[PDB]
């Protein structure tokens, strides 16, 4: 699944489709990689807890105009669900 | 709000960080900088999560001054992380 992630300025990242998951990086490239691993680790925690893992990604188009993401650089990370 | 954190060198040449006022967000990293930034992100996320749960989060923090001599903090390397509550 391709999750959109909002990178803002080090860079901070939020994952609109997965509340609570955040990451960072010195560069945008680092923030993208670190965010993907944050999502994978979150999914694994949910699996370990015995929880269902069901997500639906949004598109950037559906999120780009929300005022909370003003000035964001948008990226996409691929996570296998 | 200024959170004291205690930085530790762990085996494998990695660094861990403990958080006296939020024990459960202890974090680690491959470098000192990664470890501290990982800890700050975890503190910010903890605070934001409690706000979403409808909890109060505006409470007093410990100081390095009050903890530095406690025997359980012997050898600690101290830092302060700033978080808007």
From TrEMBL, chain A:
Annotated HicB-like antitoxin of toxin-antitoxin system domain residues: 3-81
Domain of life: Bacteria
Name under which the protein is recorded: HicB-like antitoxin of toxin-antitoxin system domain-containing protein
Biological source species: Burkholderia pseudomallei (strain K96243)
């Amino acid at each position: 699944m391709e999750f959109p992630i909002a990178v803002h300025k080090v860079y901070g990242v939020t994952v609109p489709d997965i509340p609570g998951v955040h990451s960072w990086g010195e560069t945008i490239d680092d923030a993208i990689k670190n965010t993907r691993e944050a999502i994978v680790g979150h999914v694994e925690t949910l699996i370990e807890l015995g929880e269902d893992v069901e997500f639906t990604c949004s598109t950037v188009e559906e999120l780009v105009a929300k005022p909370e993401y003003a000035g964001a650089v948008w990226a996409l990370v691929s996570v296998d669900l």
